Amino acid sequence: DPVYAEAYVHVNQYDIVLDVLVVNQTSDTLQNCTLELATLGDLKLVEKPSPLTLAPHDFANIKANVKVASTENGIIFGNIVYDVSGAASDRNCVVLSDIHIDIMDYIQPATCTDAEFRQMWAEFEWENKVTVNTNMTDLNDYLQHILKSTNMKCLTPEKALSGYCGFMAANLYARSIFGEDALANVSIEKPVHQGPDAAVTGHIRIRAKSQGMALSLGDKINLSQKKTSL
Amino acid sequence: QLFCSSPKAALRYAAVRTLNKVAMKHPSAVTACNLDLENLVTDSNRSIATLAITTLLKTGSESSIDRLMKQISSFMSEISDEFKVVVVQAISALCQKYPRKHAVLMNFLFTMLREEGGFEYKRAIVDCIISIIEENSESKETGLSHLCEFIEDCEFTVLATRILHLLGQEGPKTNNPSKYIRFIYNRVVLEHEEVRAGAVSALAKFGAQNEEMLPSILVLLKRCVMDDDNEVRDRATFYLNVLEQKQKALNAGYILN
Amino acid sequence: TGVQTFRRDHDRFWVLAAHPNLNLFAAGHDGGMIVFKLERERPAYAVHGNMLHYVKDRFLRQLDFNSSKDVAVMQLRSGSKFPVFNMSYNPAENAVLLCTRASNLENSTYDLYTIPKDADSQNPDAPEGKRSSGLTAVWVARNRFAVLDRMHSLLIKNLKNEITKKIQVPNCDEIFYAGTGNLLLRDADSITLFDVQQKRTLASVKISKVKYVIWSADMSHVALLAKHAIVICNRKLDALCNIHENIRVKSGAWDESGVFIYTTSNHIKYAVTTGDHGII
Amino acid sequence: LYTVKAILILDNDGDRLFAKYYDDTYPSVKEQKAFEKNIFNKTHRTDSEIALLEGLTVVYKSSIDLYFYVIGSSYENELMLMAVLNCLFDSLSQMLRKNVEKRALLENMEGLFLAVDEIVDGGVILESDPQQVVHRVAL
């Protein structure tokens, strides 16, 4: 419509913030509908610019701050239905459920003593694993990339050698914003001429408390793993 | 047969196992399906449970039906007259008709085995592994692939002991080095001085033989991977020290034998 | 007439309904309820100047241009309507070829119609109207050979013209019995190129389809559909870029060979031009 | 045929208040209990239509109060074998006018005993039907 509203999400530092362009290229501060607040996850949405005019030929920035540490809603991965309403110069609108709400980001790296670790590794919520196998790179650059992407930790090296092969299994740990600790041992082949690694066939073993997020994390990482057309 | 075919003589079960022998002749076999289907279906009567395994076995089966059964089994096996024991017997038979052979089945089975599980597979494993060796199975790459992976996340240290020992001998006659290494590292990965230890011991037959790339590197590796933890330190040191002590070529010859 | 009876529990009901939105259809019962959703997931097309033709997955026409909320394109080029096996433009800004009675039979009817005015069956007299019998008609690679099914199996259809309706049993070659593909892919997972008989492959290339190959209007589009994902090529396999998204529903568009339009919310966007990217 | 390893009438508390190893070649009161344990614990009042343990026939029964064990070899058909087992419940029941109970068991053993020797004697079943007995006995 003249009124075209375009919007995307910007998550700028904790705060997932809503860029909205409602552009009302309308022929007037056309009447506007209705909007509703809610508890969200460890967030709650929390602002609406008050008016409801769709000012003529006019462009507007409508900001929604979201509250990023509260409102539990357990509708995982978000993907929760959201409403913009048809309630005034509007007969309809958008009701939307979100998608676009993923993990790789959330968790931060976190750390451990290795013996205890091992013991723990085994000990943890075993229940998820996903496989590493396939890419576009060596796990040097590739590993770094993935690491940065998820913002997460590989705890320690043994020099055995991530180079000549290595035939290295890398142990990774991370802790998030709402505090889950997640453990990995992924054991991986690694690039190098007619030696081995341009796939893996390494297994990524994922432990996160619910299997459902945990595996999903293994996936998420799987998405993360490579670089291709989303 | 028919007359018995529902526990008149709950006797009927035993017979199929041998007493009245079956391994069929070709049209003859097709005819057999119905009777086995009754037992297979009924799922009850200790006499029944046993019967199901022998009849099905003797007469043999299509792949497809197995599938239906795998689910059936999924519930059944735990106790359903205490199915597990008949089943272990059944299983022992399974390992035999396919002891790492129809590997696709072996894997399907493997997935399933682990899966349907309980725990009770382990016992079975003792047999299964043995079967695979008996063939001296050759879709190992795959077979092994399943084993390796699953076992990892199918646990039990005890299994590892056995398999280790076997593996210990086998090495580079079956190649696929990077993978195999890849595995091996993992096996060690686990704690236990003890768990760790096996990868080195298996290795001696292996190392000595070397494979599609190994001698140079074989020499490089023991260096690259090294450990403290005292007696664990010692294990690294000692193997080394032992290594230290003989011309590694000689070293290999004496020790290996 | 009683077609058939369908059984799926509930020995106790009192309502049935079909939407007056017609969106969905549903049946109500004591023990409970079911809703089922319809689609001819993915469904056939033709192009004539500044106009789109669709054949419904679900939903009627929507065969170009619009005016208020949603408009299913009702025209003399009835698209999403008929009982389609296959629809292909017979290029002209004035022609289409259409198979109806769809389905599996021995063979169906195709009545091929004129954009100037389609019909129940258009004129066999007219060659922008012709109808005959035949089960399906299908494109195949190296672009002028075609498949026609005019037996309930492999007839090859080959014509220089794409006002085409040609019948060719030679190239009989089963080892794939009548089913679905369109540059040959009875789930070949390849688009495989041929002439009008041969018992020796010219060649197959390993690439894949929506089970349709997208031509830039008529019959030469190296812009490719894939069922989920679609790939952009220039004519034939040259994988220019490869598209993927993950919503198992929508579309993105080419103007001609590889002009990439992507839809982006309440924003509609050019994925790319020259070295450019843009929101029109 | 010198075929009874033992016939035991067992409590279902794994106890045995009767055992006669008609025939035996393994021992220990303990091992007997142990052997007992594996199987009894396992069958736990539950029995089976048939059970084979050891390639050996186990015909065992349960009552409404008591667990009956016979151990024999799967090397001698059910129908007969059971028939003796059947004979055991039934006669005791009729004659006494009452079948086995824990109570019954507790008041007096002897009758069981009396019967038992008569029916079977070692690994050879001298008999398996009541009637003969019934007349024969008159205690």
**In this structure, how many other beta carbons lie within 10 angstroms of the beta carbon of residue C92?**
17
CA distance C269 to chain A (A): 12
Measured CA to CA, the distance from residue A26 to residue A52 in angstroms comes to 13
Task: State the DSSP code for B64.
Answer: H
Measured CA to CA, the distance from residue C264 to residue C255 in angstroms comes to 17
Instruction: Judge: B179–A201 Cβ closer than 8 Å, yes or no.
Output: yes
Q: Collect all residues with Cβ–Cβ distance below 8 Å to A62 and sequence separation of at least 6.
A: A7, A18, A20, A21, A22, A48, A49
Angle at A31 between CA A25 and CA A32, to 5 degrees: 90
Query: Which of B3, B12, B47, B88 is most worth mutating to test chain D (most D CB atoms within 10 A of its CB)?
Result: B47
Measured CA to CA, the distance from residue C164 to residue C161 in angstroms comes to 6
Residue A74 carries which side chain, given as an amino acid letter? G
Which residue from A6, A229, A230 is facing C265, i.e. has the nearest CB? A6
Name the CA dihedral angle for B164, B168, B171, B174, rounded to a multiple of 10 degrees. -60
Please choose, from the candidates B198, B208, B115, the residue with its C-alpha nearest in 3D space to the C-alpha of residue B162. B198
Which residue from D48, D49, D74 is facing B14, i.e. has the nearest CB? D74
Measured CA to CA, the distance from residue A111 to residue A225 in angstroms comes to 22
Angle at B213 between CA B208 and CA B219, to 5 degrees: 50
Please choose, from the candidates C51, C88, C61, C77, the residue with its C-alpha nearest in 3D space to the C-alpha of residue C214. C88
Q: Is C138 helix (H, G, I), strand (E, B) or coil?
A: strand
CB B179 within 8 A of CB B168: no
CB-hemisphere CA count at 13 Å for B98?
Answer: 17
Measured CA to CA, the distance from residue B114 to residue D1 in angstroms comes to 45
> B15 at the D interface (CB within 8 A)?
no
> A9 at the C interface (CB within 8 A)?
no
Helix axis angle, B83-97 to B46-59, nearest 10°: 10
Task: State the DSSP code for C48.
Answer: E
Q: Is B106 helix (H, G, I), strand (E, B) or coil?
A: helix
CA distance D108 to chain B (A): 34
Instruction: Judge: B186–A195 Cβ closer than 8 Å, yes or no.
Output: no
Q: Which two tokens stand for residue C94?
A: 């004035």
Measured CA to CA, the distance from residue B41 to residue B37 in angstroms comes to 6
Burial class for B65, CB neighbours closer than 10 Å (0-12, 13-18, 19+): middle
Q: Collect all residues with Cβ–Cβ distance below 8 Å to C133 and sequence separation of at least 6.
A: C107, C108, C109, C110, C150
Angle at C164 between CA C160 and CA C169, to 5 degrees: 90
Q: List residues in chain A touching B: CB distance below 8 A.
A: 115, 118-119, 122, 126, 129, 158-161, 164-169, 185, 187-189, 195-197, 201-203, 205
H or E stretch at D53: strand D51-53
Please choose, from the candidates A6, A20, A16, A9, the residue with its C-alpha nearest in 3D space to the C-alpha of residue C263. A6
Q: Collect all residues with Cβ–Cβ distance below 8 Å to B107 and sequence separation of at least 6.
A: B142, B143, B146
Measured CA to CA, the distance from residue A61 to residue A53 in angstroms comes to 13
CB C163 within 8 A of CB C128: yes
Measured CA to CA, the distance from residue C250 to residue C54 in angstroms comes to 13
> Which technique was the structure solved with, according to the deposited record?
cryo-EM
Angle at A210 between CA A207 and CA A216, to 5 degrees: 70
How many angstroms is the resolution? 10.1
Chain B residue with the nearest C-alpha to that of D79: B9
Q: Collect all residues with Cβ–Cβ distance below 8 Å to A88 and sequence separation of at least 6.
A: A31, A32, A33, A34, A52
Q: Which two tokens stand for residue C78?
A: 């009835």
CA distance B106 to chain D (A): 29
Size (chain B), residues: 257
CB B47 within 8 A of CB B13: yes
Measured CA to CA, the distance from residue C16 to residue C34 in angstroms comes to 10
Neighbouring chains of B at 3+ CB pairs under 8 Å are A, D
Q: Is C180 left (phi over 0), alpha (psi -120 to 50) or beta?
A: beta
Alpha helix ranges (H) inside chain C:
none
Measured CA to CA, the distance from residue B173 to residue B205 in angstroms comes to 10
* Interface D:A, ≥3 CB–CB pairs < 8 Å: no
Q: Is C269 left (phi over 0), alpha (psi -120 to 50) or beta?
A: beta
Q: Is A15 helix (H, G, I), strand (E, B) or coil?
A: strand
CA–CA distance from B141 to each of A5, B128, B148, D66 (Å)? Answer: 57, 16, 10, 56
Measured CA to CA, the distance from residue C158 to residue C142 in angstroms comes to 11
Chain centre to alpha carbon of residue C68: 27
Burial class for D28, CB neighbours closer than 10 Å (0-12, 13-18, 19+): exposed
Q: Is B78 helix (H, G, I), strand (E, B) or coil?
A: coil
CB A150 within 8 A of CB A224: yes
CB A62 within 8 A of CB A82: no
| A38 beta partners | A45
Query: Which of A187, A189, A205, A215 is most worth mutating to test chain B (most B CB atoms within 10 A of its CB)?
Result: A187
Q: Collect all residues with Cβ–Cβ distance below 8 Å to B250 and sequence separation of at least 6.
A: none
> B219 at the A interface (CB within 8 A)?
no
